[PDB]
Design a protein around this ligand. Structure first.
Ligand code: NA
Length: 129
């Protein structure tokens, strides 16, 4: 599923991501935009052989099981395929564990490089929330 910008902001808010670990909703929408262009079916293969899955490009090295990332963990206790669902519940629940891991949203290199310190409120401007 390709979300609309305000459609994704509503789904994230409903699942409690708005101001989670102090990150305003525009931070999460900005990260999803640059990670996945709001596509739940986004995938990216990393050089190390791990894969990033879903709207927030969550990686198999630590967070999900895909059966093909030697030495990896599954700390969100999910198949990585769950991260590609039109239902963002698994992505959000796993994002909450990631952003609690110590480095906040720096865990998302695209958030650090393209969202951090920018006017992230523009990502929820005009949305009925
Ligand atoms: Na894994």
């Amino acid at each position: 599923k390709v979300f609309g910008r305000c459609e994704l902001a509503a789904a994230m808010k409903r699942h409690g991501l708005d101001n989670y670990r102090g990150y305003s909703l525009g931070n999460w929408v900005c990260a999803a935009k640059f990670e996945s262009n709001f596509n739940t079916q986004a995938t990216n293969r990393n050089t190390d052989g791990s894969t990033d899955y879903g709207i927030l490009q969550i990686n198999s090295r630590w967070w999900c099981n895909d059966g093909r990332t030697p030495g990896s963990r599954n700390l969100c206790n999910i198949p990585c395929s769950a991260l590609l669902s039109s239902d963002i519940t698994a992505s959000v629940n796993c994002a909450k564990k990631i952003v609690s891991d110590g480095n906040g949203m720096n865990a998302w290199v695209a958030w650090r490089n393209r969202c951090k310190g920018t006017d992230v409120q523009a990502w929820i401007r005009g949305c009925r929330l």
